Write an enzyme that holds these catalytic residues in place. Structure first.
Site, short mmCIF file in Angstrom:
data_model
loop_
_atom_site.label_atom_id
_atom_site.label_comp_id
_atom_site.label_asym_id
_atom_site.label_seq_id
_atom_site.Cartn_x
_atom_site.Cartn_y
_atom_site.Cartn_z
N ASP C 67 0.74 -1.33 -0.07
CA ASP C 67 0.07 0.06 -0.04
C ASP C 67 0.75 1.12 -0.12
OD1 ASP C 67 1.02 0.18 2.34
OD2 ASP C 67 -0.74 -0.01 3.64
N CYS C 70 4.72 -0.20 3.05
CA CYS C 70 5.42 -1.59 3.45
C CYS C 70 6.68 -1.66 4.03
CB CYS C 70 5.28 -2.56 2.03
SG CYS C 70 6.35 -1.96 0.77
N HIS C 227 22.55 -9.38 -0.64
CA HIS C 227 21.82 -9.06 0.31
C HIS C 227 22.73 -7.56 0.78
CE1 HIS C 227 24.68 -11.77 2.16
NE2 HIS C 227 24.80 -10.69 2.90
N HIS C 247 8.71 -3.87 -3.25
CA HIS C 247 8.03 -4.37 -2.26
C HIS C 247 8.98 -4.92 -1.16
CE1 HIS C 247 4.54 -5.32 0.01
NE2 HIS C 247 5.17 -6.86 0.17
#
Ligand SMILES: [Mg+2]
Lengths: 148, 76, 255, 76
Positions: C67, C70, C227, C247
């Site tokens: 939305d 996040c 990462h 996201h």
């Protein structure tokens, strides 16, 4: 819920410390609908006028903006014939840290100083830019007719 | 492949695209059909705002996917 | 035309509603296999490969609603999960949040709204501390939009404050025509705005936490995947997030 | 010539580059020093994002200029 609690806080602060030229509050039992009034600024062609507005808070306030429109007709480049208001704070730049008091201050400020970037009513924007004498005359005439 | 782009009014625009097409490419494609400058287009799929430099594959957009076209606020 | 700008606002609201019906703010835990099941070898081989490799290290995923909020939501879920397991940490974070509250007024934030968000979040933490809020109650609060978004605003606010505290350093990293002041007012303080690296760095440092972001894109990677640790300085990360383009979700090591 | 790339960790990376080098070439050089793949990098100069196919001379980047690097981490 949280929206209603926030709206109560907005009302308390506005009653205690209202923006200059501005008043506002609920019309009845519904806390989500307010009416507001703005006095035409002095040294403006809206001087002497009283302009009414309608505020509707959404159910997810303060995370979405309040909806604010004039109900008094007004001659202005950034306010249209339906009373819709072209002001960033109401749409693109709303944040939950803002209040209805700051919105009203911003609307007042807009009455004294119209935004020229992509105006809501291009014809009136032209007249403001190029023929201030006429702009002031018409604005004063509409003030007399609709806001007195 | 076929993807769909749903506008403000409900109107569905059909496009033909590769998975490796960039979002910028897809916006140029939408410009070709509706005449809307890419600078005014936002594309949304599955909640995500789609980045100009990325590909359709980066968002796992498949055959018959539906994106939303949301124009940018003008203000004033 | 403003039927224009209002019509866009209405459309944005309808799109958000559409996403809300499908996904809670904060899901219950799922095993990592569920993430792998989003992909397949016929149409999404690269993402499948990443997810399967990550399944060696991670046992569960907690989906966070897409939305626009996040990143902030994943972090606050991460922080609250630490505080539920670490009572001393909770107590310390309460005292420090009261400090952030006075810090916001000092920096000239809008007085009562910002303090209202701070106080709500502090009371929520105090009630976890006192046992008035059970663990189940906490996840219910984090899924109830009104209270969940109040809490999330605290995190938006400290993100903004930290950027303003460090404006000279951070100004040249902004690439969209804005000062640090303008960026905060347009991109950090409002709800529904995506977080970029600048905002991400700020929140993590302002909250005093340590995060590992598993960067799950399609790029061929060394063994274990790409990462990034923030801060990057050898303490183990307290929160682990999964980033897929656009996201953030929260993920959990097996051991 | 030398250029500098500032990061949000506070580290300055020093690079050896020619005005004819592309932004893509610069990102590959950052990968050699820091291990970030070019597709995860965003480079900024004069407050705007730099495009991969353009050169350092296209952007007037010259001796001892400073760029800023962030990771492509935008998300909702
Ligand atoms: Mg290399």
């Amino acid at each position: 819920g949280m929206a209603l609690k926030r709206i109560h806080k907005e009302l308390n602060d506005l009653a205690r410390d209202p923006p200059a030229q501005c008043s506002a509050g609920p019309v009845g039992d519904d806390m989500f609908h307010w009416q507001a009034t703005i006095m035409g600024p002095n040294d403006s062609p809206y001087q002497g006028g009283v302009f009414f507005l309608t505020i509707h808070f959404p159910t997810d306030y303060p995370f979405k903006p309040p909806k604010v429109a004039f109900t008094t007709r007004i001659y202005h480049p950034n306010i249209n014939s339906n009373g819709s208001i072209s002001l960033d704070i109401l749409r693109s730049q709303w944040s939950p840290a803002l209040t209805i008091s700051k919105v009203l201050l911003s609307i007042c400020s807009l009455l004294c100083d119209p935004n020229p970037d992509d105006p809501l009513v291009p014809e009136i924007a032209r007249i403001y830019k190029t023929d201030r004498e006429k702009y002031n005359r018409i604005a004063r005439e509409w003030t007399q007719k609709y806001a007195m | 492949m076929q993807i769909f782009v749903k506008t403000l009014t409900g109107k569905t625009i059909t496009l033909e695209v590769e998975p490796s097409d960039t979002i910028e490419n897809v916006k140029a494609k939408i410009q070709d059909k509706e005449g809307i400058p890419p600078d005014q287009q936002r594309l949304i799929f599955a909640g995500k705002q789609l980045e100009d430099g990325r590909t359709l594959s980066d968002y796992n957009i498949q055959k018959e996917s539906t994106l939303h076209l949301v124009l940018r606020l003008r203000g004033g | 035309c403003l039927a224009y700008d209002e019509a866009i606002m209405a459309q944005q609201d309808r799109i958000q509603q559409e996403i809300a019906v499908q996904n809670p703010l904060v899901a219950t835990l799922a095993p990592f296999s569920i993430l792998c099941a989003e992909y397949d070898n016929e149409t999404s081989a690269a993402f499948l490969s990443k997810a399967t490799e990550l399944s060696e290290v991670y046992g569960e995923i907690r989906y966070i609603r897409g939305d626009g909020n996040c990143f902030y939501r994943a972090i606050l879920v991460g922080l609250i999960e630490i505080m539920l397991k670490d009572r001393a940490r909770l107590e310390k974070f309460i005292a420090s949040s009261r400090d952030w509250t006075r810090t916001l007024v000092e920096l000239g934030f809008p007085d009562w709204t910002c303090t209202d968000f701070c106080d709500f979040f502090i009371e929520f933490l105090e009630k976890i501390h006192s046992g008035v809020h059970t663990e189940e109650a906490v996840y219910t609060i984090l899924n109830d939009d009104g209270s969940a978004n109040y809490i999330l605003m605290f995190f938006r606010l400290i993100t903004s404050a930290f950027l303003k505290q460090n404006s000279e350093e951070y100004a040249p990293f902004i690439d969209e025509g804005m000062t640090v002041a303008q960026y905060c007012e347009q991109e950090i303080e409002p709800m529904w705005k995506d977080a970029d690296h600048l905002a991400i760095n700020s929140l993590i440092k302002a909250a005093g936490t340590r995060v590992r972001i598993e960067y799950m894109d399609r790029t061929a990677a060394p063994n274990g995947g790409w990462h990034y640790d923030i801060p990057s300085d050898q303490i183990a990360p307290e929160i682990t997030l999964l980033y897929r383009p656009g996201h953030y979700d929260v993920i959990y090591k097996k051991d």
